[PDB]
Each structure stands twice: as structure tokens, then as C-alpha cells.
Design a protein around this ligand. Structure first.
Ligand SMILES: CCOC(=O)c1ccc(O)cc1
Ligand SMILES: *C(=O)CCCCCNC(=N)N
Ligand SMILES: [Ca+2]
Length: 223
């Protein structure tokens, strides 16, 4: 996250870190046994780390749980990033508490101008590379469809939305991928792609979770 702020320990209790011997992507806990992330974050050997703040120090409240299944959307396209969504089943159920909690799926889509919270352990620099120990947060609005298409002509499908700031300096970044965009207590987005980080006129692009509620429910119900 570039131009954000320190969230504070466990203030984003649905935020998870996906770890393969290092932090590689974020994700969102949606019930005690299932996590939502980006399809482009797929690999084998995923360990889900819940209740994290400092991802480099054991502080208390952490639960490390191996993924038993990682389910990429069958229509995920690795070149366009259309359908950039993946479900991860945990080998065992997380124990839920004030510091490890699920986030509700949306009942309807959010409108342009809705303020959201984006969080993650990604790069905090627009220029060069700096990775934080602790979780970073950013408040950001969802942009209009016309602004989003103007920013990324021919690249925005109906399964994507833009959020952030056209002036530059505030954005999600590498390492934030797969993490949550939460608007009034609902998971509306997943960190997906963008052109550089925090560049003028190049906002972040996010998977539109409201288009996938039925698929999520059906996939969970059958696994
Ligand atoms: C047409 C989809 O947009 C891209 O070409 C694109 C894909 C991945 C990425 O990181 C940036 C742009
Ligand atoms: C995931 O970490 C791949 C990097 C894309 C993150 C989103 N980029 C952006 N908001 N400019
Ligand atoms: Ca820790």
C-alpha cells in the first residue's frame, strides 16, 4: 500500500497473509474454513496466516493453517485477468475470535464514490521497493465506469472496477494482490492489477466480488 497508514494490530481481522516460506499475496476470510483471494495468486504449498499484524514476528493471536484446496475460477484468463478470483479451503477450521473474523459478502454491488478500505503488506513505495512489517490501510473511493475505462481503454471488463486516486500517491501495490476492498462491512473487491503503483491517472483495478456471490456459495456448498 502506497500513501496509506498503519492499520493497528488486528483492526482488519478478516485480512490474511498467504505464505509459501514468505508473504506473497493477501486474502479475505469469509467463513471459518474458506478464504477469498486472486486467481493470479495461485500456487501449491499455500499456508494461510490469520490474525497477523507483524508478519515477521510471532506476537500472539496468529493461526497458521495449510490450504487443503485452492480453486481458481474456471474462466480466469491469465492475460486479461478477467475473473481474477480464487477460493482457498483451509485444512481445518480457523477458530474465530475478535482478532480472526470473517467478512460478509455483498448483497448488491457498490456505486461509484463509495468509500472503501484496502489493506495489505505490499510495497509502500511508488518509486523503488520497501516492504512493511505491519499491516497497512488506505481509504479509497470506487471510480465511475467512464473514468475507469478512460484510464484503461479496452481493458476493463464488467468483472472489474477502479478505485483510488487519479492524482497519484495513494494506491495498492505488489504484495497487496488478493487482498480485500471492503465497503460498509462488505467485501466488494479483490486487489487485482494496475499500471505501476500510485501513478497519476492510473488507479488500481479490482475484481468485482458482487458478480461472484452465487459462484462462491455454490463452490463452497459442493466442496
Ligand atoms: C488487458 C489486461 O491488462 C493487461 O494487459 C495487464 C495484465 C496484467 C498486468 O499486471 C497489467 C496489465
Ligand atoms: C499484486 O500484488 C499485483 C500488483 C498489482 C497490485 C495493484 N496495482 C495497483 N493498484 N496499481
Ligand atoms: Ca506475526
Amino acid at each position: 500500500i502506497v500513501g496509506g497508514y498503519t492499520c493497528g494490530a488486528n483492526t482488519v481481522p478478516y485480512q490474511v497473509s498467504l505464505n509459501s516460506g514468505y508473504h506473497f499475496c493477501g486474502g479475505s476470510l469469509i467463513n471459518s474454513q474458506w478464504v477469498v483471494s486472486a486467481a493470479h495468486c495461485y500456487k501449491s504449498g499455500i499456508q494461510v496466516r490469520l490474525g497477523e499484524d507483524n508478519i515477521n514476528v510471532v506476537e500472539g493471536n496468529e493461526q497458521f493453517i495449510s490450504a487443503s484446496k485452492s480453486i481458481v475460477h474456471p474462466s480466469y484468463n491469465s492475460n486479461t485477468l478477467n475473473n481474477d478470483i480464487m477460493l482457498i479451503k483451509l485444512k481445518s477450521a480457523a477458530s474465530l475470535n475478535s482478532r480472526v473474523a470473517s467478512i460478509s459478502l455483498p448483497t448488491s454491488c457498490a456505486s461509484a464514490g463509495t468509500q472503501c478500505l484496502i489493506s495489505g503488506w505490499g510495497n509502500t513505495k511508488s518509486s523503488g521497493t520497501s516492504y512493511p512489517d505491519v499491516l497497512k490501510c488506505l481509504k479509497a473511493p470506487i471510480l465511475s465506469d467512464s473514468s475507469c475505462k478512460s484510464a484503461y481503454p479496452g481493458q476493463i471488463t464488467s468483472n472489474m472496477f477502479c478505485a483510488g486516486y487519479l492524482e497519484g500517491g495513494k494506491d495498492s501495490c505488489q504484495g497487496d494482490s488478493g487482498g480485500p476492498v471492503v465497503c460498509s462491512g462488505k467485501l466488494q473487491g479483490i486487489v487485482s492489477w494496475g499500471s505501476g503503483c500510485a501513478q497519476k491517472n492510473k488507479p488500481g483495478v479490482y475484481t468485482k466480488v458482487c458478480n461472484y456471490v452465487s459462484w462462491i456459495k455454490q463452490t463452497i456448498a459442493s466442496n
